From Swiss-Prot, chain A:
Component of the 26S proteasome, a multiprotein complex involved in the ATP-dependent degradation of ubiquitinated proteins. This complex plays a key role in the maintenance of protein homeostasis by removing misfolded or damaged proteins, which could impair cellular functions, and by removing proteins whose functions are no longer required. Therefore, the proteasome participates in numerous cellular processes, including cell cycle progression, apoptosis, or DNA damage repair. Belongs to the AAA ATPase family. This is 26S proteasome regulatory subunit 6A. The chain holds residues 367 to 439 of 439 of the full protein. It comes from Homo sapiens (Human). Component of the 19S proteasome regulatory particle complex. The 26S proteasome consists of a 20S core particle (CP) and two 19S regulatory subunits (RP). The regulatory particle is made of a lid composed of 9 subunits, a base containing 6 ATPases including PSMC3 and few additional components. Interacts with PAAF1. The modification Phosphoserine is found at S10.
UniProtKB/Swiss-Prot annotation, chain B:
PROSITE patterns: PROTEASOME_ALPHA_1, PROTEASOME_ALPHA_2. GO terms for cellular component: cytoplasm; cytosol; extracellular exosome; extracellular region; ficolin-1-rich granule lumen; nucleoplasm; nucleus; P-body. It comes from Homo sapiens. InterPro entries: Ntn_hydrolases_N, Proteasome_alpha, Proteasome_alpha-type, Proteasome_asu_N, Proteasome_sua/b. This is Proteasome subunit alpha type-2. The 26S proteasome consists of a 20S proteasome core and two 19S regulatory subunits. The 20S proteasome core is a barrel-shaped complex made of 28 subunits that are arranged in four stacked rings. The two outer rings are each formed by seven alpha subunits, and the two inner rings are formed by seven beta subunits. The proteolytic activity is exerted by three beta-subunits PSMB5, PSMB6 and PSMB7. It is found in: Cytoplasm; Nucleus. The modification Phosphoserine is found at S7, S14, S16. Signal peptide: none annotated. The modification Phosphotyrosine is found at Y6, Y24, Y76, Y121.
UniProtKB/Swiss-Prot annotation, chain D:
It is found in: Cytoplasm; Nucleus. The modification Phosphoserine is found at S110, S177. One of its GO terms (biological process) is immune system process. This is Proteasome subunit alpha type-1. The 26S proteasome consists of a 20S proteasome core and two 19S regulatory subunits. The 20S proteasome core is a barrel-shaped complex made of 28 subunits that are arranged in four stacked rings. The two outer rings are each formed by seven alpha subunits, and the two inner rings are formed by seven beta subunits. The proteolytic activity is exerted by three beta-subunits PSMB5, PSMB6 and PSMB7. Interacts with NOTCH3. Interacts with ZFAND1. It comes from Homo sapiens. PROSITE patterns: PROTEASOME_ALPHA_1, PROTEASOME_ALPHA_2. There is a cross-link at K115, K208 (Glycyl lysine isopeptide (Lys-Gly) (interchain with G-Cter in ubiquitin)). The modification N-acetylmethionine is found at M1. PANTHER family: PROTEASOME SUBUNIT ALPHA/BETA (PTHR11599).
Curated annotation (Swiss-Prot), chain E:
It comes from Homo sapiens (Human). Component of the 20S core proteasome complex involved in the proteolytic degradation of most intracellular proteins. This complex plays numerous essential roles within the cell by associating with different regulatory particles. Associated with two 19S regulatory particles, forms the 26S proteasome and thus participates in the ATP-dependent degradation of ubiquitinated proteins. The gene is PSMA3. This is Proteasome subunit alpha type-3. The 26S proteasome consists of a 20S proteasome core and two 19S regulatory subunits. The 20S proteasome core is a barrel-shaped complex made of 28 subunits that are arranged in four stacked rings. The two outer rings are each formed by seven alpha subunits, and the two inner rings are formed by seven beta subunits. The proteolytic activity is exerted by three beta-subunits PSMB5, PSMB6 and PSMB7. Interacts with AURKB. Interacts with CDKN1A. Interacts with MDM2 and RB1. Interacts with the C-terminus of TBXA2R isoform 2. Interacts with DNAJB2. (Microbial infection) Interacts with HIV-1 Tat protein. GO terms for molecular function: ubiquitin protein ligase binding. Keywords: Acetylation, Cytoplasm, Host-virus interaction, Nucleus, Phosphoprotein, Proteasome. One of its GO terms (cellular component) is nucleus. The modification N6-acetyllysine is found at K53, K202, K226.
Amino acid sequence: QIHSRKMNVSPDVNYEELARCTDDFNGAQCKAVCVEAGMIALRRGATELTHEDYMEGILEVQAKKKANLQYYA
Amino acid sequence: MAERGYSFSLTTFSPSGKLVQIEYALAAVAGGAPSVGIKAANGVVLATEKKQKSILYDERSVHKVEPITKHIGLVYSGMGPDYRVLVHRARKLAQQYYLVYQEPIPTAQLVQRVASVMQEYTQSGGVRPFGVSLLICGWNEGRPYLFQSDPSGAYFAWKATAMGKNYVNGKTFLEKRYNEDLELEDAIHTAILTLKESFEGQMTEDNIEVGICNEAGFRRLTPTEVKDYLAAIA
Amino acid sequence: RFSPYVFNGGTILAIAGEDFAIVASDTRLSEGFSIHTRDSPKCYKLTDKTVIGCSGFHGDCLTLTKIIEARLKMYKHSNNKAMTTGAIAAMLSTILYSRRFFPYYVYNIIGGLDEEGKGAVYSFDPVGSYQRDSFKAGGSASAMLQPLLDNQVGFKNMQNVEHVPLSLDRAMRLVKDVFISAAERDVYTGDALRICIVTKEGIREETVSLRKD
Amino acid sequence: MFRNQYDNDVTVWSPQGRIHQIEYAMEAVKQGSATVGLKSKTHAVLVALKRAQSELAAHQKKILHVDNHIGISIAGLTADARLLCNFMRQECLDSRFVFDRPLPVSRLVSLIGSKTQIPTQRYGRRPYGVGLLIAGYDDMGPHIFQTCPSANYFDCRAMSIGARSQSARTYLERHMSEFMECNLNELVKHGLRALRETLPAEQDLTTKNVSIGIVGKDLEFTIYDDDDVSPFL
Amino acid sequence: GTGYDLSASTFSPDGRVFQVEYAMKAVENSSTAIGIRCKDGVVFGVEKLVLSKLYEEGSNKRLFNVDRHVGMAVAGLLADARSLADIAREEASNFRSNFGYNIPLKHLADRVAMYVHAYTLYSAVRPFGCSFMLGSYSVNDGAQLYMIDPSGVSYGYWGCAIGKARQAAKTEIEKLQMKEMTCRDIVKEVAKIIYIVHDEVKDKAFELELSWVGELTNGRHEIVPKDIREEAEKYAKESLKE
Amino acid sequence: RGVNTFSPEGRLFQVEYAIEAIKLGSTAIGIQTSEGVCLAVEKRITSPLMEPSSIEKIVEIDAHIGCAMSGLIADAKTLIDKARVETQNHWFTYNETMTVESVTQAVSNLALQFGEEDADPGAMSRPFGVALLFGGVDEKGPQLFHMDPSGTFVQCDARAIGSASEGAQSSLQEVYHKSMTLKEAIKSSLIILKQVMEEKLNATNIELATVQPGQNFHMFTKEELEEVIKDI
Amino acid sequence: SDVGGCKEQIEKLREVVETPLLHPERFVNLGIEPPKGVLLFGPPGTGKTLCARAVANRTDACFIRVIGSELVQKYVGEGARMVRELFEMARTKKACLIFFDEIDAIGGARFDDGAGGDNEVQRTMLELINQLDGFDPRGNIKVLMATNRPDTLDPALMRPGRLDRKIEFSLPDLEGRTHIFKIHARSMSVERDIRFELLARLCPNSTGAEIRSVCTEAGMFAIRARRKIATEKDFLEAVNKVIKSYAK
Amino acid sequence: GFDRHITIFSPEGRLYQVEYAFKAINQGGLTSVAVRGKDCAVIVTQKKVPDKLLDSSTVTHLFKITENIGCVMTGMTADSRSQVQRARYEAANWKYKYGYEIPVDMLCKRIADISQVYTQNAEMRPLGCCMILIGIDEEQGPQVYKCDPAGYYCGFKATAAGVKQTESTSFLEKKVKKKFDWTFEQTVETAITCLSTVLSIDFKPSEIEVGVVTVENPKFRILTEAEIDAHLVALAERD
């Protein structure tokens, strides 16, 4: 919330779900996701940062958060 | 596990063509307190040194010569616990096989059994071979006697040999002094001298253990008896 | 030593339509000269328009029945699909062929309806074996009742002038009449009579009581 | 480093005492399909998404009829699940033969757990990487349990598995009080909504993927499949 | 590489293995349980942290029974504790029928002690990471309390406690009476200790759980819920708010 | 470095590798239409001193279920022996017909035995490297399933597997229709099979079979294949 | 020159390096600051290497190449001195790229804390961290790191607030291979009536470097044949050698 | 060599791992001593606790192995307790089978063989403990045998345990010239005295735990306070 004050925000932000999903992060790495979410946001053309940008951002490697799909038929 | 572990052995062929673990056991042997053997032909003498290192002891408690049978005896150089265990299994095998039959034990057959147990452990893993070398001493009739058994699994006949610390040096002394006809009393004098030459920390009637195979096989010497020989020639 | 064979069987009668079947049974169960119980049938509804009856000994009868029921449940789990009558017919036999070493036995019969819009009844021997029926009486009193049953219901012997085709109603009258008659000729028949009537609507039960003395 | 070390030991213990194997197992649950579980505690429903790999296929089932009073949804790989399911059916069969009782699903679930846990407690066994939402209608009502391949057994009044589980959880907590001990219809609507939360939400609702399964006071195991959910939509 | 995380069937330059120390770190990493023994019986109490409202307890707790005269509580991982325990009751039961006696507390311990030490000698089966607190009232011997550690160490106690709080709890406990009044009085007292302990643990709610083996229970193992739990709670709420 | 490992991803290593092995084999094609299932294959050839007359890779499991297999060919020889027997056992027990699907499940149980660990009972150290397209006809009509080396089965109506699969499946879409003539299909199949090839189109490297209700499982003969060539 | 499976790596590298220098004023309005370093891994000379030069030419900022292995010295304290010197120069010029060639020599492996001059190399590794995490700020300075397998490297080197994006290489899809072949076919005399993609599906899946190499092999056979145009025949031959060459 | 997941023969002549068992065999500060007379054999140990939330009426490190035999253990607690249980079964069995009493020495030798095998396995380690056996035989009189877990055991004229063994040894030798001049109790007194000098603690009634074996009785008993205080008082009078 403190870091996001510089950043342009759409009005709802649902930090609690995000905070929980995030795991084993140091103080810099959480900050890292935020700036990054703004970079993702830049690619969209979106002028306001929204929930979805963050979700992609944490999923990215920086404490070995990763995902893969295919383990279903 | 309970059947998992190392199926193949610690010992392994080398591009040397030597067996590493085997090499180490000659070292393991090396550390042993001084041992000798003299074959008096009609008799046999085996002797060794009890080092002593704690004044706190009792009796003459554990030995380093134990009777397998009433006719053959073992003495060794290498690791003591291994020795106790080695004697137990063999001792069990000697009695069982030669009470099926009523014939008394042939020497070679004991050697064949000790070597196999040593060899199976070389073949298999999980367990390591024993790191002892034995002198199999017996008497029976007019047969040859005094035999040596390696941690290697090999056997040889000898007239005389030596073990323990500085084995090569003692054997060279032994080689020169030991010749022709001798007596059972005479063989004892020599063995004490050869042990003294290897090292004397001291010799008392409790640094020495001497046993012979002569009248009706293995007989254990009294402490006084040996002491008579020490005076007979120091 | 102790027995490896005890009798307990009753008497039953299975009658096959061509779109219905009825399987009827006494409730009286006896062995010899002492009476085990004055109640209980050996005919049961397995379900889905399959009716089954196991005559021979009560101890065996409950056990087979329970056991079959799981094989049917398991089968449906294994992929949706059910045993037909015929399937069940093979399944009982394998069990029996195993039991040929076991010293207790039973005389089993299965009845139900096909999807050919008619009855099938298959009857087994107490060693294994199967045969196609038209009509079967099973149990003790069977041997005496059956030639007459065969003739009155059937008209398929070489000793009758005519045929008539079955009717349900008519089958019910004949069945009661045979049982009421059976009773003063046995001490294995009596008390009450339990009728399982099998139709394509569903399974109905009727009970009527009989004489005793 | 030592990532390979921690795979190589199934007896693993680290300075922080973590067991990575469990961790891996959790990522595998998140890889699976989307499933929700809901109960009023007089009816229980589960909306489950059944998906298809490509256009010319048709969806694979993830709702399994374990018994005619108990059932599950699977979320994770199909192959392991089949193996577990035979053991549990046979455990139900002997209950019926010997005892002639259904047996508490609570009691059942606990037993299955042990037999898995003990092989993690020694050499061999990789994680099974399927999580389950297990439903059943027992003597004291329906009950809902989450079985994990961490053998973490918990009874919940509703739960969810699938990536973005948390989303739907938060809605379930919000609507939680509305669920009460009635209405069939209401539970399903909330489920359809909730299920939308689990998905990326760019994918629009479809009747071929969804599947609705109910068990309740006089109900046993029934599945609504394809089009059949439209009546109740 | 230390060369001995790999093993668990060997010696190290620290003697025992690193794996065994780690198991000891993990119990302390868990929640918090205490036990107080008295001359009339023995009381167990445990703190459980609340997660969220969806959940509910109905077979997963932290208080566990042994047999039908033995009380059992644990710190560490739930699933593994339950696995140890099911076997213990069963082992106890075969005894119970066979010798015809209702097992001692002391004999049960010995049986568990031996199991854990055997697993330290091998590398086949990784150890449990639990610590188990057991005890009851024996009709002719008294109350006896034991605690078994994953460290292959077990003793008889007047008090024992485990969890993050351990050091601190034992201090307060240490302050109190040997006799400690009557059992009933202790139910209230243990509740103050937990009540106060939670200010130190507070990040979310807790639920207070108490149990007993009492002279009034006649040596059987029962939970203390009901009005009885609530009064002890009121008394803590009055005294301080922490 | 265990292969008893689950993998940190949690996506087992060995299964993934198998798909690569498959990309190296031939191309096998299936279209099931409204009535009938067709399976077409490339059995290939290379040298003139070879007899592929001998070779095959499309087998009839029974006269009402067939399978085409693709991948490490020796494994599939093991795979079929188990299946074929299991089907036959059901005929001893109930003298009745098995579903294509029931047969496919039975074989998938056997797909999991890899390892010597305690998630799988050992016999094998690794899995079968093959996918199969399982066809049959029953009361649920002609159906097709794709047996996935991932020890799982998915249902299908049209599928290609093979090296060319990525392209082929795309090509398969335009020509597929929910209703299309069986004979028409065979021509459509032939077109995709032609496209993949670099080597000559002859009746001595490609093989067709179909199952129709009116004549059982039938393997298509050379003379028949040559006629199909003439039409397109 | 190897784009096709190097395609993803290009797309991201432009966004990280080029875009901040081209349009900085935009990033400020938003209130976002871009990373300072990106990481390259996989085999060199496959276009992992090319990619760093290819952006260097496009981006128009000086490409400064330091070989970490060289920085290593015979006598202590010198090594730190070097690290420091590099950073002072880097600061002055603002907008520059520091290309680190296979930092693993003084890149991580290492946590053991000495055992005999594993300390001296560790001191350099730690000194770099000080400058990065320190009071300096990024500026317009960009860092490209080169590792074999990224695994080697230590958690300190990995950690955010210096390393954030790790740009990867990959097994190239079939379509991709064709683009690389397409690049090659302008120089190489061909006859287009045959199509390389069909062969390529049949050929082993392999990264970009082997794909150019088989082509290169193909021209030779022509030259022996005494033909000036490519042929279908040449292509068949190349696969047998190449399949052998990885396995030595 | 490679101690890492196997143990082999080395030029070291011992094993790093065997030495490590010798080295840390106590993780507390207890020390023990044992002396042998022809009037008694006494083992003197300590009682110590860290707090008083713990009981001390079940805490002990002296074990009654059987009526005649007594055993004090120096070792890791887990390992000491295991070994006792194993021994208890083996003794009992020896009584059943032979019908005659198990010699003290015989047990030490049997146990020693069990230690030794584990030394051959590179899939299992030996238990970490030194076991001192004490007893009263009618076949040589009282007997005092110490084991070490190398497979080594021997009988001694007296011995000491804890980490300060060598220091205790020096007192012991001085004493051991004359020890057949001590009567019953005076054995006990000297025995207290040599632990008090090493350890540098003038004992207290709840810090000490003397165990005595008594000749002409098959008793092993830990002494009552009155007797233990009577001795303690006895050394004051000579100070």
